[PDB]
Amino acid sequence: RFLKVKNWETDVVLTDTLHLKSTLETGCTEHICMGSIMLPVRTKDQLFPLAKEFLDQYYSSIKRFGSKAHMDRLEEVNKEIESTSTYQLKDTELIYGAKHAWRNASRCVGRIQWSKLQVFDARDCTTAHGMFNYICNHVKYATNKGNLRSAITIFPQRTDGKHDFRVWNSQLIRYAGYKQPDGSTLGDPANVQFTEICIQQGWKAPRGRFDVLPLLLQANGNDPELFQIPPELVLEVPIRHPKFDWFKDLGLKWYGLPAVSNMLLEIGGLEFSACPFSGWYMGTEIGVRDYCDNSRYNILEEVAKKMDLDMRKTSSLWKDQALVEINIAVLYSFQSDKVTIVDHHSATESFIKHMENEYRCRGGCPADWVWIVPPMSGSITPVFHQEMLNYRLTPSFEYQPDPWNTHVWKG
Amino acid sequence: RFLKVKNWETDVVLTDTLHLKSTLETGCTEHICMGSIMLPTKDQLFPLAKEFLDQYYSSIKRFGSKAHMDRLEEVNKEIESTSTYQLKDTELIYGAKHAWRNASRCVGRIQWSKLQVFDARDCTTAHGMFNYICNHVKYATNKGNLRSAITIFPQRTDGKHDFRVWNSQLIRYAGYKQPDGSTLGDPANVQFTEICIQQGWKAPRGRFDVLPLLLQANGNDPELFQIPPELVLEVPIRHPKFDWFKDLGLKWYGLPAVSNMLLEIGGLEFSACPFSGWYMGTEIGVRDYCDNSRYNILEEVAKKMDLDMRKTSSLWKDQALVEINIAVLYSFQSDKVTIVDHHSATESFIKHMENEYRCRGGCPADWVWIVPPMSGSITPVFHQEMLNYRLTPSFEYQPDPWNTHVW
Ligand code: HEM
Ligand code: HEM
Ligand SMILES: C[C@H](O)[C@H](O)[C@H]1CNc2nc(N)[nH]c(=O)c2N1
Ligand SMILES: C[C@H](O)[C@H](O)[C@H]1CNc2nc(N)[nH]c(=O)c2N1
Ligand SMILES: NC(=[NH2+])NCCC[C@H](N)C(=O)O
Ligand SMILES: NC(=[NH2+])NCCC[C@H](N)C(=O)O
Ligand SMILES: [Zn+2]
């Protein structure tokens, strides 16, 4: 069953066959689309089949499908699973796995870079201090003095679900958020809950508007431990505008390395609950969402004032005018300081090329339009005009519940 | 069964039960989401009429009354007899209003109950259609104080006697393919602009030439008619700061009137049902003016603004986009022609969603179409989870007539 997607701006039509290999569910039915919904211990029984599908894809990728090496690997894993109820991936398989989870991430517009992922194998890690060390190395390698490199660090996989490794932070680097008694929020509102947990764990909060949070790391199902990332390892960019000299006076800045650290990486049935990964920012992430979401730093009003914009009536599009400026400032500041960053026009054009390539060389490219289209200037980016098919392939990156909601504290 | 949708900016959570009354398909499956795809018998008829009549009577608090049973029986007999049926006026009006109520891609539905319905089922010729359409346009335009309306021509019978408005909108600008290879006017209408000529229209070959109506009645071939210019309200586009803006030579019409859709009520198909409301600014400023395959005007505007168009990262396209859309809203307002900005419109939709959830148990909505084409996340709908599903009565797409007509 073939399926075609059309780009209404170029009339280019593509045919998708890859969706046929999709096994997981979407959340949608023939009766309802849940396309805009944010979030719509395994058994030996269910493990080997997942393992075989993976190994089959892996061996095909290296052109050794059906070889003796392939067959022996299946036999070996089968035995190991029956013998230990789980199995260990070879280094080669882990790298292939991690790269494909990124390749299969439908919400990611930066996937044209998927094959260049640097994979750090932290499966020999046993303690939080060990985790802290791997994480520091990942940040230094990835930051590369501003010339960012994509990377992922993979800690030991889940076993019985009672010895999980977890990074409690949502990103390796992020700013604290503090709820004030007058109801206002100091810092980043998105991290208030986590910030409270850190303080409760012993962190001495400096209580400023841009305090880098400490790492709260959990190894082998133990209680999480706090660690401060060496400041010299955290690259930050002061935000200023190329034409407005007062912009710098807003005292804004952001970190250069975006590193999601709360997702779960699934490979051949195995679950890697601590798999922090990083790339580089697309401007709008900071400029539109982190700075202008009403629930984030919410700086639109203050910026519009300084610009002396008609804020009497929305139809003056004062919000839209200020948004552009703020986004111009983010891109400008990063570029001046030579910290890697990509604007939405450039990133989306690249994704379209990546997508076309994938259809031609792979038979498709699962993509989530709701997420792919930038939060500003939607239709002036090619992705808006591009029809997309969203479906779940493994290996994959999945959401998981915040650990403070599931953790059995030991004291 | 009972689905919940959350607004991530306000934490407000709504529970959707209305979807349980969904009847049509979405194009999606448990294995694949096609949410961004633009276009995913007497025995057949009676159940549909029944479903409709039941909701109709339920709506008037006479569910299961004699009147209900009676009407049900009457239509039933009429169908078994005529193989079809006719809606009472009350039912026609309710059907049309609800078709708008159920249009998941429309962000202006808070106005659904105020729809003026013009019953043109007694129409029989293209001239007749032209007359009905002129009246609709004048009524809806109302000197700039726009009023929503829909005119409903005769329903389908055998499919060989269909009424159809060939234009895609009652009022639209012509598009001509020049030797240069480039396109003059509106590229979206290059083709239709040709079928008119292939029919006799004397194209003034301009940038904003109001197209002619090409009307099809009872199945016969379509005819051309020039809408009285005094009936076409237009707005000269100028900027409230860039005097050079007016120089751009831009203008647009004030009445958006989709004319190529099909209205389905109780199984009955109305293939010619033009309807109009009023514009949301971005429709013109972002889509019509800046789409690459439309009037594609960003470069010129950026130029005049003297912006650094060397690097995409200077965001000249975005800056220009903003100014343009400022000018559309400014013009319309200055000429007292109804128009709504995407901020005000989206705020209204959120309120409408809430009302709909509490008074009806839900509101089918297509996020991909609801979120405006610019400044997405600074509008509230961006942060609003939505459930898309098909409820009837509804407005459906249908093949362009020139790809089905047997001259
Ligand atoms: C090279 C630079 C990269 C760019 C420019 C890029 C861009 C983006 C953007 C703009 C988003 C949406 C983020 C949001 O709205 O919160 C995103 C999402 C995503 N990306 Fe990428 N990305 C990059 C690298 C990576 C890497 C290295 C991985 C994985 C190995 C990855 C995995 C994902 C996933 C799984 C999501 C969805 C996360 C969620 O659901 O919250 N990306 N990316
Ligand atoms: C009163 C003012 C109204 C406003 C502000 C409004 C706004 C909008 C907007 C912004 C769109 C998207 C247009 C596009 O992208 O092409 C839309 C679509 C739609 N609206 Fe409304 N609308 C209004 C009245 C109407 C009326 C009166 C009806 C029908 C009775 C209606 C039916 C629909 C339908 C069926 C669609 C989707 C059409 C398609 O698929 O191309 N709208 N509306
Ligand atoms: C409710 C809606 O799904 C939600 O606000 C989505 C929309 N698109 C998005 N797109 C990206 N890239 N990131 C997001 O966080 C979101 N949020
Ligand atoms: C391919 C994609 O579905 C297409 O470009 C959609 C996106 N969202 C839209 N939203 C609205 N309101 N109108 C449109 O025409 C579209 N086009
Ligand atoms: N380009 C990326 N790798 N993004 C990861 C998500 C970062 C998140 N959206 C932020 O604004 O901090
Ligand atoms: N507001 C409306 N009723 N719009 C109907 C569709 C009009 C179309 N989007 C246009 O720009 O011409
Ligand atoms: Zn769907």
CB contact under 8 A, B313 and A300: no
CATH class of the domain whose range is A236-258+281-346: alpha beta
Binding residues of A: 36, 108, 171, 280-281, 285, 370-371, 384, 399
**Cα–Cα distance, A242 to A336 (Å, whole number):** 10
Dist. CA B276 → ligand 2 center (Å)? 8
Structure tokens at A124: 């020999």
Does A182 touch chain B if contact means CB atoms closer than 8 Å? no
From residue A220, how far is each of A59, A130, A238 by CA, in Å?
31, 11, 38
**Which chain A residue shows the shortest CA-CA distance from B31?**
A25
The domains of chain B are located at 16-121+148-158+262-276+346-370, 122-147+162-233+397-401, 234-256+279-344
Tell me which residues of chain B, numbers 33 to 62, contact chain A at a CB-CB cutoff of 8 Å.
33-38
Q: Whose CA is nearest to atom 1 of ligand 5?
A: A281
DSSP conformation class of B284 = I
- Nearest residue in B to A23, CA atom: B31
Among this protein's residues, is B283 annotated catalytic?
A: yes
Helix (H, G, I), strand (E, B) or coil at B167: coil
Nearest to B107 by CA among B365, B334, B396: B365
A298 and chain B in contact, CB less than 8 A: no
CA distances, B170 to each of A345, B145, B210, B235, B255 (Å): 35, 18, 10, 17, 9
Asked if B34 lies within 8 A of A389 by C-beta distance, the reply is yes
Closest CA to A112 of A348, A334, A320: A348
Q: Is the alpha carbon torsion for B357, B359, B361, B367 positive or negative?
A: negative
Q: Which residues of A are designated catalytic?
A: 108, 111, 280, 285
DSSP code string of A328-392: HHHHHHHHHTT--EE-HHHHHHHHHHHHHHHHHHHS-----HHHHS-SSSGGGSGGGGB---B--
- Return the ligand number nearest the Cα of B256: 6
Written as one letter, the residue type at A22 is S
For A124-149+164-235+399-403, CATH gives: 3.90.440.10
Give the count of beta carbons closer than 10 Å to the beta carbon of residue B22.
20
Cβ–Cβ contact B125 with A under 8 A: no
Active site residue B194: no
Cβ atoms of B356 and B362 closer than 8 Å: yes
CA distance A284 to A264: 25
Other CB atoms within a 10 A radius of the CB of residue A228 amount to 13
Cβ contacts of A28 on chain B, cutoff 8 Å: 26, 28-30, 32-33, 35
The CATH fold assigned to B16-121+148-158+262-276+346-370 is: Nitric Oxide Synthase; Chain A, domain 1 (3.90.340)
Please tell me the residue having the least CA distance from ligand 1 atom 4.
Answer: A110
CATH code reported for the domain at A16-123+150-160+264-278+348-372: 3.90.340.10
Nearest ligand, measured from the Cα of B35? 7
Residue identified by tokens 């996989």 is A157
Superfamily covering domain B234-256+279-344: Nitric Oxide Synthase; Chain A, domain 3 (3.90.1230.10)
Contacts of A370 in chain B (CB under 8 A): 35-36, 367-368
Q: Can you tell me the distance from the alpha carbon of A117 to that of A99, in angstroms, rounded to the nearest whole number?
A: 6
DSSP secondary structure letter of residue B173: B
Contact between B123 and B384 under an 8 Å Cβ cutoff? The reply is no
Ligand 1 contact, A150 CB (< 6 A):
yes
| Closest ligand by atom to A341 CA | 1
Q: In this structure, what token pair is assigned to residue B380?
A: 């509230």
Judge contact between B21 and B51, C-beta under 8 A.
no
Distance A286 CA to ligand 3 centre (A): 14
Q: Which residue of B has its CA nearest to A316?
A: B326
Query: Which structure tokens are listed for A173?
Result: 């680097």
Q: Which token pair is A181?
A: 């008694």
β-bridge pairing A151-154 and B213-216: unpaired
Ligand 4 close to Cβ of residue A387 (< 6 A) = yes
Q: Does A375 touch chain B (CB under 8 A)?
A: yes
- The residue of chain B with its CA nearest to that of A341 is B313
Contact (Cβ atoms closer than 8 angstroms) between residue B101 and residue B109? yes
Provide the residues around ligand 7 (an ion) whose CB is within 5 A.
Answer: A 28, 33, 35; B 28, 33, 35
| Residues facing residue A264 across a β-bridge | A398
Query: Is the domain defined by B122-147+162-233+397-401 classed in CATH 3.90.440.10?
Result: yes
Name the method of structure determination: X-ray
B7 and A CB contact within 8 Å: no
